[PDB]
Amino acid sequence: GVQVETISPGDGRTFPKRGQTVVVHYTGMLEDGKKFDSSRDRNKPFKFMLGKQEVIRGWEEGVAQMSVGQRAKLTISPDYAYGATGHPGIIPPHATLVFDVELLKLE
Amino acid sequence: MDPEFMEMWHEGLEEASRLYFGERNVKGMFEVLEPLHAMMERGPQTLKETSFNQAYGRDLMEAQEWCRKYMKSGNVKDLTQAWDLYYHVFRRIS
Ligand SMILES: O=C1[C@@H]2CCC[C@H]([C@@H](/C=C/c3ccccc3Cl)CN1Cc1ccccn1)N2S(=O)(=O)c1cc(Cl)cc(Cl)c1
Ligand SMILES: [Ca+2]
Ligand SMILES: [Ca+2]
Ligand SMILES: [Ca+2]
Numbered sequence: 001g002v003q004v005e006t007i008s009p010g011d012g013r014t015f016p017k018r019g020q021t022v023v024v025h026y027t028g029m030l031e032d033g034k035k036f037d038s039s040r041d042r043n044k045p046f047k048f049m050l051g052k053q054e055v056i057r058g059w060e061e062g063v064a065q066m067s068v069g070q071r072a073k074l075t076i077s078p079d080y081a082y083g084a085t086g087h088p089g090i091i092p093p094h095a096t097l098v099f100d101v102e103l104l105k106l107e
Numbered sequence: 108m109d110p111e112f113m114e115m116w117h118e119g120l121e122e123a124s125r126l127y128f129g130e131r132n133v134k135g136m137f138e139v140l141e142p143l144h145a146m147m148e149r150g151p152q153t154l155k156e157t158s159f160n161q162a163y164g165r166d167l168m169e170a171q172e173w174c175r176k177y178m179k180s181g182n183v184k185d186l187t188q189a190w191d192l193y194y195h196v197f198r199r200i201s
């Protein structure tokens with residue numbers, strides 16, 4: 001599954017709704033701590049539409065639990081990420097992922 | 108599912124992804140994949156080649172389109188779209 005561990009709370013009122021565009025900054029790391037990607041390194045907030053399953057299951061469910069302004073650590077088991085396949089070139093098979101996520105806004 | 112089309116895209120996407128994500132080489136990624144796309148344009152032949160095209164061919168064509176767009180835009184969102192499609196196919200042929 002996915003665990004959300006708050007670093008800094010959001011407003012506690014404004015949560016992602018199906019069909020909204022969710023805007024975040026993130027850093028992704030393997031379970032060992034090696035960074036594989038970060039939106040902050042390219043200074044480009046990452047966007048996705050909630051409910052489209054455009055992102056891994058751990059994001060869909062984890063980020064939906066966050067409110068605007070919140071910063072949190074998402075720990076995502078392989079089955080809620082890239083599973084047995086991994087993603088070639090970047091995510092090995094059976095990888096637990098750890099993300100730092102900041103929910104910037106909803107549009 | 109034509110074994111040879113499956114194999115060439117499996118290995119191709121492994122290489123293209125290593126070059127892009129691992130070696131930060133987007134030109135190298137595009138070079139590996141361009142001849143695989145051109146091979147699809149030549150159109151099916153076997154019953155298995157036709158089956159491959161029906162399952163994956165439109166997704167692959169659209170992935171190339173997103174790459175071509177990246178070539179003019181430089182917007183990684185376009186390249187993400189491409190990988191979404193490539194990965195959708197990769198995962199089913201592996
Ligand atoms: O679900 C994700 C997750 C979570 C939201 C942010 C990105 C997303 C960002 C991808 C991205 C960013 C910049 C350049 C290229 C890419 Cl493909 C990827 N996805 C959906 C997805 C699209 C295409 C292929 C595989 N997975 N990740 S990720 O950090 O696990 C990730 C980053 C990268 Cl550079 C590649 C992959 Cl395969 C996954
Ligand atoms: Ca995905
Ligand atoms: Ca289709
Ligand atoms: Ca489609």
Ligand SMILES: [Ca+2]
Binds near residue numbers: 188
């Ligand atoms: Ca994107």
